[PDB]
Design a protein around this ligand. Sequence first.
Ligand SMILES: Oc1cc(F)ccc1CNc1ncccc1-c1ccon1
Lengths: 245, 245
Amino acid sequence: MFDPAEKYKMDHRRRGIALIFNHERFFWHLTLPERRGTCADRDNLTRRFSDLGFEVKCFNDLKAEELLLKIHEVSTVSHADADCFVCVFLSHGEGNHIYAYDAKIEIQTLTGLFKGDKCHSLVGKPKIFIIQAARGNQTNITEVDAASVYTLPAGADFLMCYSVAEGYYSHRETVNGSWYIQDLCEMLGKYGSSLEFTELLTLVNRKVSQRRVDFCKDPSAIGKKQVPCFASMLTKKLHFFPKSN
Amino acid sequence: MFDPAEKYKMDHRRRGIALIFNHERFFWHLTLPERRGTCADRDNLTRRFSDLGFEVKCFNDLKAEELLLKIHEVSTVSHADADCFVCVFLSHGEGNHIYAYDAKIEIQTLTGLFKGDKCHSLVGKPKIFIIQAARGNQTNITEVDAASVYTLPAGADFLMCYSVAEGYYSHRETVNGSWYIQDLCEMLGKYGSSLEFTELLTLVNRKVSQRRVDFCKDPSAIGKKQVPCFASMLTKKLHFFPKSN
Ligand SMILES: Oc1cc(F)ccc1CNc1ncccc1-c1ccon1
C-alpha cells in the first residue's frame, strides 16, 4: 500500500543533534583569510535550529584531530530516540574538502560516519549537511568568494545543502554574515515549523538568486551572482512540525 | 508580497521540448559495451513526457558533432511560448562527461547553452536534465555499472536528475530497461500530472533505494545498492498539471 505523501516519522522523544563547525581563523601556514561574519552565521543557525527542537552543539576553530574526534563521538552515540541529524560546516573548502583550522578533511569521511552501515540508529532518518564553504580569497563590507566545494550527494536519506554552485560566487557581510545563511535562517524563522524542508530550501534558492549584484561598492564584485543548490537523496517528505511536550 | 507557495508559470501555449539522446552502441575503438535495454528507457520516457504535453524529440547514437548541432539548434530556437525544457542522456559517462557514439562531451557545455545568458526565452523557466549514465565494464539479464558521472548542479532554475550517486551502482534489465528510468516512468504515469516534480523524484529515490540486491542470480552483484539523487537549483514549485486545449 505505497503512499505518495509518506512523511519521515518525526514523533521520536528528541528532534536530534545539530553539529555546527564554525571556522573564522586558520593556521598561519595555510595562507587562508579570516571569515569575518561567520559568528553571525553560527548564532543565527544556532537560534533557528534550537527553536525547531535541536540540541545544537557549536565548535569554534577545531584542529582536524579534534573535529574528527567530536564528529566520530556523535556518530557512535545512539540516535535511536531522535528524529534526525543536522551537521553544518562554516569554513573554507576546495573540491571534496572542508578546512579545519589545521588542514583539510574529505567531506565523504564526515558524511560516511552516518551511513546506514556505520550508524544503525539513523537508518531511514534524515541526515542533513549544510555547507557554507568557498575559496580563501586574498564597517559591514560584503566579501565575495568563488564557488570551490563540489555539490556532492551522500547516500540514502542524506540531504546535502550548498551555499553556492559551480561558476557562481558566495557572499559574506562582515557583520550580518553569509547571504545563504541569512536567507536560510529567515526562511527557518518564517516557515521552518510548517513547510517541507526541500520546499523551504527552494525558497532559499529564490531569495539568494534574486539578490542584486549590478550596483556594488567594489566594481570587481559586479555580475558575480549567487545560486545555491541542494542534492537530495531523501525518500520521504521532511517536516519539522512542533514536537508535543 | 513574497509567497512561499509560488509555482513556475506553466500556462504558456506549449509545454516545451524534451530532447532524448539515446546511446546503445559505440565506436569500436572506445571499448564501451552495448547498453541492451536503453530502447525501453527511450520509449518509456517518450510516452510519459508526451502524455505531460512535451514535444519529444529522440536521437539514436549521434556522433559528437551531430549531437552538438542538434542541441545548439534547440538552444537558439525560441522557447518564448513554452513552459520549460527537458533534456535526457541515456549513455555511458565519466566525471564531467557523457558519451556520444564517437567521443565524450562536457555536460557543462550542454547545460551552458540553456543558461539565462545564452537562451533568453528560458530565463525563469525550469530546465530539467535527466542523466542515466555510468561506467561501461569491459533473456532479460540485470547488468550493473558503477556510478561514474558527477552529480553536478547547473544554474538558476535548472534541476539535474541522476540515476545513481557516488559509491552506489546503476542497474539495467536488458529488456525492461534501467531501474531508475522504470521507476521514474512509473511515477510519471501515476503522479506526473498532480505531484510537484521534486516530490515525484523523491518517490523515485524511495522506489529505487528499496529495490533488493541480496538475492541475485549473479553472486558478484550482491549488496550493490542503487540510490539516485537530484541537484535542485529551482526557485519555485514545479507542476505539470494538464494543459487546457
Ligand atoms: O559542483 C561543483 C562545485 C564547484 F564549486 C566546483 C566544481 C563542481 C563540479 N564537480 C563535482 N560536483 C559534484 C560531484 C563531484 C564533482 C567532482 C569530483 C571531482 O571533480 N568534480
